[PDB]
């Protein structure tokens, strides 16, 4: 009886960590993609400036 109770308790804790970790990783991964999107937009701007010099 005690083993199953301890098993369920510790297993519940492990599942909570798994859910929060997934919820945290999704948001962090999204933020990384957003920074890359913003950087790409600005990089495009700089390339237009360089092309203007060349022209």
């Amino acid at each position: 009886a005690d083993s199953i109770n301890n098993f369920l308790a510790n297993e519940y804790l492990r599942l909570q960590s798994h859910i929060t970790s997934r919820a945290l990783n999704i948001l962090k991964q999204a933020q990384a993609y957003e920074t890359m999107n913003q950087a790409a937009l600005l990089q495009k701007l700089i390339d237009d400036a360089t092309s203007a010099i060349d022209n």
Binding site: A39, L42, Q43, I46, A49, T50, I53
Partner: protein, 188 residues
């Protein structure tokens, strides 16, 4: 001018030329020796026998002394005569040409006149050249100079001035490179 040559060097020809410059500038004269050394340089390249004589090393000291006298015992400043005697005694006669050249260099450094070279891609119109002279004048404004032009660069619309030992770049090519580099480092 303080009996001090422009530069001090430990090379053989440098050592002798500096002593000659100091000694000559000491008593009274530098321009007289300049003509003497200039005459030797022209002769070293124009007269074949004279060049072979100087380079000849199997020659005895007395023989070298007699041939030099036959060249001329006057029209050479006493310093020049004493210099030749010393060279003969020290077997340094072969290096006499270099010394000459080196000396004139120092003399030409004392010359205030200088030649300025401008490099531009586009051909310089005469009207534009006059403006350039006005700018160089206003820059110096205290020394007369002779201008030289040269147009075969990769730069465009840019001017680069060489003045003896100084270089000033106003080329647009530099501006192009600087901007492309700084735009890269924006670190947005």
């Amino acid at each position: 001018p303080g009996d001090k040559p422009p530069a001090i060097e430990d090379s053989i020809h440098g050592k002798y030329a500096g002593v000659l410059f100091s000694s000559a500038s000491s008593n009274k004269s530098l321009n007289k020796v300049a003509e003497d050394m200039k005459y030797f340089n022209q002769l070293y390249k124009e007269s074949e026998v004279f060049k072979s004589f100087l380079n000849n090393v199997s020659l005895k000291r007395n023989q070298q002394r007699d041939i030099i006298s036959a060249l001329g015992k006057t029209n050479f400043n006493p310093a020049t005569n004493n210099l030749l005697e010393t060279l003969i005694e020290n077997k340094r006669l072969d290096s006499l040409p270099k010394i000459a050249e080196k000396y004139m260099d120092y003399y030409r450094i004392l010359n205030k006149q200088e030649s300025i070279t401008i490099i531009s891609a586009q051909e310089l119109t005469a009207a534009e050249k006059q403006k350039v002279e006005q700018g160089l004048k206003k820059g110096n404004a205290n020394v007369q100079f002779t201008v030289v032009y040269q147009v075969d660069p990769a730069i465009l619309g840019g001017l680069q001035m060489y003045s003896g030992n100084n270089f000033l770049d106003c080329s647009l090519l530099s501006r192009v490179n600087k901007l492309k580099t700084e735009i890269a480092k924006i670190s947005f």
